[PDB]
Design a protein around this motif. Structure first.
Motif, PDB file in Angstrom:
ATOM      1  N   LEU A  56     -25.755 -39.581   2.307  1.00 38.01           N
ATOM      2  CA  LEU A  56     -26.096 -38.846   2.835  1.00 38.01           C
ATOM      3  C   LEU A  56     -24.992 -38.996   4.228  1.00 38.01           C
ATOM      4  N   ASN A  57     -24.981 -37.398   4.778  1.00 40.70           N
ATOM      5  CA  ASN A  57     -24.193 -37.847   5.564  1.00 40.70           C
ATOM      6  C   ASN A  57     -23.538 -36.913   6.740  1.00 40.70           C
ATOM      7  N   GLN A  58     -22.733 -36.839   7.067  1.00 42.52           N
ATOM      8  CA  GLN A  58     -22.700 -35.627   8.833  1.00 42.52           C
ATOM      9  C   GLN A  58     -22.301 -34.404   8.012  1.00 42.52           C
ATOM     10  N   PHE A  59     -21.955 -34.424   6.547  1.00 40.78           N
ATOM     11  CA  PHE A  59     -22.141 -33.241   6.111  1.00 40.78           C
ATOM     12  C   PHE A  59     -22.306 -32.638   5.263  1.00 40.78           C
ATOM     13  N   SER A  60     -24.330 -33.306   5.106  1.00 42.27           N
ATOM     14  CA  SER A  60     -25.397 -33.412   4.118  1.00 42.27           C
ATOM     15  C   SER A  60     -25.733 -31.748   4.141  1.00 42.27           C
ATOM     16  N   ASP A  61     -25.648 -31.257   5.112  1.00 38.20           N
ATOM     17  CA  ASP A  61     -26.511 -29.727   5.484  1.00 38.20           C
ATOM     18  C   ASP A  61     -25.300 -28.150   4.964  1.00 38.20           C
ATOM     19  N   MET A  62     -24.364 -28.878   4.224  1.00 35.26           N
ATOM     20  CA  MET A  62     -23.219 -27.726   4.150  1.00 35.26           C
ATOM     21  C   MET A  62     -22.108 -27.576   2.584  1.00 35.26           C
ATOM     22  N   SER A  63     -22.111 -26.194   2.922  1.00 34.17           N
ATOM     23  CA  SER A  63     -21.793 -26.000   1.458  1.00 34.17           C
ATOM     24  C   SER A  63     -19.923 -26.747   1.537  1.00 34.17           C
ATOM     25  N   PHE A  64     -19.706 -26.560  -0.042  1.00 27.65           N
ATOM     26  CA  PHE A  64     -18.053 -26.950   0.146  1.00 27.65           C
ATOM     27  C   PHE A  64     -17.159 -26.096   0.840  1.00 27.65           C
ATOM     28  N   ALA A  65     -17.826 -25.099   0.806  1.00 29.97           N
ATOM     29  CA  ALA A  65     -17.077 -23.626   1.016  1.00 29.97           C
ATOM     30  C   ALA A  65     -16.317 -23.756   2.400  1.00 29.97           C
ATOM     31  N   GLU A  66     -18.408 -24.033   2.783  1.00 30.81           N
ATOM     32  CA  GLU A  66     -18.058 -24.062   4.747  1.00 30.81           C
ATOM     33  C   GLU A  66     -16.986 -25.212   5.317  1.00 30.81           C
ATOM     34  N   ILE A  67     -17.357 -26.779   4.366  1.00 31.79           N
ATOM     35  CA  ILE A  67     -16.505 -28.062   4.603  1.00 31.79           C
ATOM     36  C   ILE A  67     -15.198 -27.544   4.730  1.00 31.79           C
ATOM     37  N   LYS A  68     -14.919 -27.059   3.722  1.00 29.85           N
ATOM     38  CA  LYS A  68     -12.994 -26.620   3.773  1.00 29.85           C
ATOM     39  C   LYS A  68     -12.311 -25.708   4.620  1.00 29.85           C
ATOM     40  N   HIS A  69     -13.403 -24.655   5.283  1.00 29.27           N
ATOM     41  CA  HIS A  69     -12.888 -23.664   6.324  1.00 29.27           C
ATOM     42  C   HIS A  69     -12.854 -24.480   7.423  1.00 29.27           C
ATOM     43  N   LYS A  70     -13.562 -25.345   8.037  1.00 28.90           N
ATOM     44  CA  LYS A  70     -13.870 -26.194   8.723  1.00 28.90           C
ATOM     45  C   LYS A  70     -13.706 -27.464   9.247  1.00 28.90           C
ATOM     46  N   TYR A  71     -13.156 -27.768   7.708  1.00 28.19           N
ATOM     47  CA  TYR A  71     -13.151 -29.566   7.557  1.00 28.19           C
ATOM     48  C   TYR A  71     -11.118 -29.518   7.473  1.00 28.19           C
ATOM     49  N   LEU A  72     -10.823 -28.946   6.609  1.00 26.21           N
ATOM     50  CA  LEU A  72      -9.369 -29.560   5.057  1.00 26.21           C
ATOM     51  C   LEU A  72      -8.595 -28.410   5.965  1.00 26.21           C
ATOM     52  N   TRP A  73      -7.904 -28.388   5.337  1.00 21.31           N
ATOM     53  CA  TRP A  73      -6.597 -27.429   5.786  1.00 21.31           C
ATOM     54  C   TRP A  73      -6.342 -26.814   5.417  1.00 21.31           C
ATOM     55  N   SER A  74      -6.006 -25.218   6.211  1.00 20.30           N
ATOM     56  CA  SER A  74      -6.916 -23.740   5.721  1.00 20.30           C
ATOM     57  C   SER A  74      -5.492 -23.142   4.874  1.00 20.30           C
TER      58      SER A  74
END
Ligand SMILES: *[C@@H]1O[C@H](CO)[C@@H](O[C@@H]2O[C@H](CO)[C@@H](O[C@@H]3O[C@H](CO[C@H]4O[C@H](CO)[C@@H](O)[C@H](O)[C@@H]4O)[C@@H](O)[C@H](O[C@H]4O[C@H](CO)[C@@H](O)[C@H](O)[C@@H]4O)[C@@H]3O)[C@H](O)[C@H]2NC(C)=O)[C@H](O)[C@H]1NC(C)=O
Ligand SMILES: *[C@@H]1O[C@H](CO)[C@@H](O[C@@H]2O[C@H](CO)[C@@H](O)[C@H](O)[C@H]2NC(C)=O)[C@H](O)[C@H]1NC(C)=O
Length: 312
Positions: A56-74
């Motif tokens: 578990l870490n700071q990303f554990s309550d997010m889907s990967f879709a949300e992670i991709k939109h918020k944290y990775l290159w768009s």
């Protein structure tokens, strides 16, 4: 729809307080479902046989879709290149290298926040190391200047960018300011570059040939930590320790979406790996670092590597 057990619930309650979250009753329910889904994925993975563990870490309550939109290159970056300038010499190379151990040559782990600016941390990290290796002076350079000002070299602030393009920006801009004069905001802002406040400078940019992972080995061994980009997928977000690898990530330049900094390499139980500094804070992974399997162009990590030669 999962039936969430009380162990998962009580741990989600602690997680929310640790990460200072507030949810409406209706979003709480959807967040708990994602948390429980990740909880079971982590346990299912860790209870099996793999070369890395999840947690578990700071990303554990997010889907990967949300992670991709918020944290990775768009959007994909111009990682693919038909020209390069780095030419590898001859091995063999040391069995293991770790610029963190050779001296005060790697800066502390930073946090990019909710912004796809990992290319700026990969860039400052590489140049901070280069200046420290060349001069014995460890600086902290301004990622926000790259976010705000490097657009003429086809970089795009929080949407993404590339270390090699950022090194060229610093070269032609005549330098980069420090974190002290140009603090990091984690969002796209107005360019506030001041020429008389630049403290770090680039003389040349070394581009490693596409897929030339052995030249990366040589460059880390002989010269400097090496900036590179790779494809992050959902399992990587939950990486905790060990040697990361994946059969579902792609290996091509058009699919990479996250830039980082190789600071060394080694091998454990016959498995070669890279030692890589990330920019998700010091409580992600192994004190902010991860290991990723070496020699396989894993997740495309050899697609567009680069490092700077500092002007000192
Ligand atoms: C490694 O990978 C990187 C990233 O892909 C490549 O980066 C390019 O590097 C070249 C230099 O090799 C850069 O080109 C140079 O850009 C300078 C700034 O351009 C801006 O400003 C001028 C006005 O000063 C505008 O006209 C222009 O439109 C931009 O807004 C220019 O000053 C340079 O011009 C000088 O050299 C050229 C050489 O072609 C002469 O024609 C000129 O007369 C002048 O003397 C030059 O154009 C380029 O911007 C970088 N691109 C990116 C995307 O970052 C590296 O090339 C690559 N390394 C190797 C060895 O392949
Ligand atoms: C990849 O590189 C191409 C070529 O340099 C970029 O396309 C240029 O984009 C600028 C600004 O958007 C335009 O002014 C040029 O006319 C474009 N040239 C061509 C030939 O298309 C492209 O933007 C880059 N992609 C990324 C993601 O940075």
């Amino acid at each position: 729809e999962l039936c969430v057990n009380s162990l998962e619930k009580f741990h989600f309650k602690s997680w929310m307080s640790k990460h200072r979250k507030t949810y409406s009753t209706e979003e709480y329910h959807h967040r708990l479902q994602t948390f429980a889904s990740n909880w079971r994925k982590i346990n299912a993975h860790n209870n099996g046989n793999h070369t890395f563990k999840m947690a578990l870490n700071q990303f554990s309550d997010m889907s990967f879709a949300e992670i991709k939109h918020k944290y990775l290159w768009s959007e994909p970056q111009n990682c693919s290149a038909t020209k390069s300038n780095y030419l590898r010499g001859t091995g063999p190379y040391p069995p293991s290298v770790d610029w963190r151990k050779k001296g005060n040559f790697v800066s502390p782990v930073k946090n990019q926040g909710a912004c796809g600016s990992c290319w700026t941390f990969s860039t400052t990290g590489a140049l901070e190391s280069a200046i420290a290796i060349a001069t014995g002076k460890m600086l902290s350079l301004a990622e926000q200047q790259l976010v705000d000002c490097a657009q003429d070299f086809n970089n795009h602030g929080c949407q993404g960018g590339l270390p090699s393009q950022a090194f060229e920006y610093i070269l032609y801009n005549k330098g980069i300011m420090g974190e002290d004069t140009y603090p990091y905001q984690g969002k796209d802002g107005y360019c506030k570059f001041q020429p008389g406040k630049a403290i770090g400078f680039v003389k040349d940019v070394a581009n490693i040939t596409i897929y030339d992972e052995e030249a990366m080995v040589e460059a880390v061994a002989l010269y400097n930590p090496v900036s590179f980009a790779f494809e992050v997928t959902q399992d990587f977000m939950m990486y905790r320790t060990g040697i990361y690898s994946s059969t579902s990530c792609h290996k091509t330049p058009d699919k990479v979406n996250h830039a980082v900094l190789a600071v060394g390499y080694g091998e454990k139980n016959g498995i070669p790996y890279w030692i890589v500094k990330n920019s998700w804070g010091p409580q992600w992974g192994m004190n902010g670092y991860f290991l990723i399997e070496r020699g396989k162009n894993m997740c495309g990590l050899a697609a567009c590597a680069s490092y700077p030669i500092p002007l000192v």
